[PDB]
Amino acid sequence: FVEPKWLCKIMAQILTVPKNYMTQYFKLLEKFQIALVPSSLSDHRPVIELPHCENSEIIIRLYEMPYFPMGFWSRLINRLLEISPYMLALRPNRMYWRQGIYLNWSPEAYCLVGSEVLDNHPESFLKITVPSCRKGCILLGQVVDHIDSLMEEWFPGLLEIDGETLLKKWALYSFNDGEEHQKILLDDLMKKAEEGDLLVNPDQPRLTIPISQIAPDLILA
Amino acid sequence: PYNRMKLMIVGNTGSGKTTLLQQLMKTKSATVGIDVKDWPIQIRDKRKRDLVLNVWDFAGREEFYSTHPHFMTQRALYLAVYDLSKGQAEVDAMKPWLFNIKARASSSPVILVGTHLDVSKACMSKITKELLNKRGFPAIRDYHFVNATEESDALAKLRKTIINESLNFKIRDQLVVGQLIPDCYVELEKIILSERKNVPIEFPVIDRKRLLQLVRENQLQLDENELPHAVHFLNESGVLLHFQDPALQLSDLYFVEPKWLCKIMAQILTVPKNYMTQYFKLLEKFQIALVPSSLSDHRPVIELPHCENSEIIIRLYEMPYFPMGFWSRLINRLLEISPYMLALRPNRMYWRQGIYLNWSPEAYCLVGSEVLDNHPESFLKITVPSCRKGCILLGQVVDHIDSLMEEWFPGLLEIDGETLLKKWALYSFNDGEEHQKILLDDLMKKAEEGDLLVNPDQPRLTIPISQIAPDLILADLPRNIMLNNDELEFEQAPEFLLGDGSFGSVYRAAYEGEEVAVKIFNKHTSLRLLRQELVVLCHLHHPSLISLLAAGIRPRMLVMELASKGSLDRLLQQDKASLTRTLQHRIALHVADGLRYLHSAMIIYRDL
């Protein structure tokens, strides 16, 4: 491509609305993240009543950052496009919006990525919900690796240590027996440094939770 | 004589309703709720029949549309105001309202009223007299071009027409305006009207005990067993509202002054610490609770697991418009009450016009509005996988939808016959690879039950009717219950091989090498009730309960295991000596075991 302003203008033409190169046109349209148009996806979360409540049957992980990068969600949706299967096949149900994917195989083999806003926090979050079973653990591993790879490949400045690091990966655990709520949030690096043992324990050490059912990507589960 | 009838003032937003009403009653701000009132008409003719219309100024704004079909009854006259100013398009903008009057109250008059005559376009009578007269619409009986904000000869003629057209109602020659009632009913109505004044304004509700104290405190001779009939009749006339249903905890509270209830209920759609739980219960009864309205109206992208026309089952439902609160009641009805198995909670992705329950990649169910090209009508496409679990879901959904239509919107099924509701079934002779599913009306396929296949002009191709409409052929149930007509030796009706007790049409025959009793369901009735019976009896499976061997479509019959000695009634009436003490105890034990199993599954056998 010589005279690049023509390529860029032509590519941005369809976002406001050579018969030989039609297939190449579409290929580089996907390379620009235009193809299903990832932009103009109604921006409105549709109500989703998940099958599993109870804090001891789901695994949550957040991803905090001051804002979502420009083309963040588009590249992520494109990257997560059926490239994260529970098994090693079956195509899962998918309910996309502008900031989520929600692949769903079964009531115990689902995966919901999607922006979630919290009270008294101007920052942005990327809550990931996943069932606590084996198939759930597989999905969580793939998704975290995919997200981390994308960050390291496209947005390196969000990981450069100065050190708040501008990107703090949380892990929501609940010592509260699963019945009660308000999941205590623990920075991931601190839990990584807690690999010396195989359990997490509060001020009252009669309670305990295995780090597998909190962050099964660290312990090889 | 009961001189009282409901006047309902329908219309679109912004179009003059409360101002027309203020000038109709000579009683010299957006409506919230339905704003009930009542004006008495002292007719000065020789027949001085002093009648009292109670008006219902329906709110035009869309967010309230979920609660309106609860307050549309048959014994009522309708107005329909439509703002002449934006002529030639405001008439085509009120066809949804008229279609809804047609669905709910199919035999009630409608008096079209055109406001805003001061500004401008009076040739809107052309489209009113051509397209709006008889083509699926609720029998319009007058049309006026009136002004508001001032009384004149226009409003005078309009008021006299409302009066006249009211008195000559005559549903099947009944003359609603002058029927007879027990005197105790009108006495009860007068004491309620007096109680309207002596009650706290912050809470006008009255207690059933307070009502009992009131009816006793005066000479009203209404017995305790008579009160339900009386209070329900006053409900129909729009004096007081009440809900005798025991599913709610409201039957002790009798809503007097209904305009307060309606306004309070519609309060939350724009945004007494004891009755909070009852408040929420009747909030769901009005379809307000998760608020089914304001659900973003935008279908979210859904990439289903299964493409290929030979692996999914589609059914449409065509109608000119969706009724007012249609999708709300449907979502509420489909709320986890249709499980694939007989347990597991499924994934759900609601929007304003869909549900999409989803268990597994082969056990999903997607209901939702789907619009087609070159078709101004509305559709209700249902997608479902072709497997067994899919078939179960499709049966439940169709039965739920059909029940809702017959219960709430009867006018959408009344045969004249286009019927205003044409259920399609999308089949594809094209081997599944190719596309453009040929659509076949369901009644025609029902008439094609003589065979068990569908065949095109080129009969080398064929498709079994199971993989098209598994609710007609008995395949939606679990456990294939086909009859295998070869084994049967049934004799149609010789006045012989009869069950002997004439309980139904049950005969006697031999099937699978054993004697069996065959109940012949075949009659003028449809296959709904047959499916209802078949489901209940297909998964109970207890030794005390009678077990079903098979069922069959041609002709409609169901094959039950034969009881050798017949009913217990005949045995005790004619063979009393045969009952030993041990035998009596065994009969009692078996019946008790049946009741125990039935109550385990939360079923009440009632009459035993």
Ligand SMILES: Nc1nc2c(ncn2[C@@H]2O[C@H](COP(=O)(O)OP(=O)(O)O)[C@@H](O)[C@H]2O)c(=O)[nH]1
């Ligand atoms: N000038 C004029 N204004 C009218 C006429 N009919 C209605 N309006 C206007 O309509 C408004 C009333 O709207 P309203 O019926 O209360 O809305 P609704 O409660 O949603 O039905 C008033 O502000 C009137 O000015 C008319 O014939 N002439």
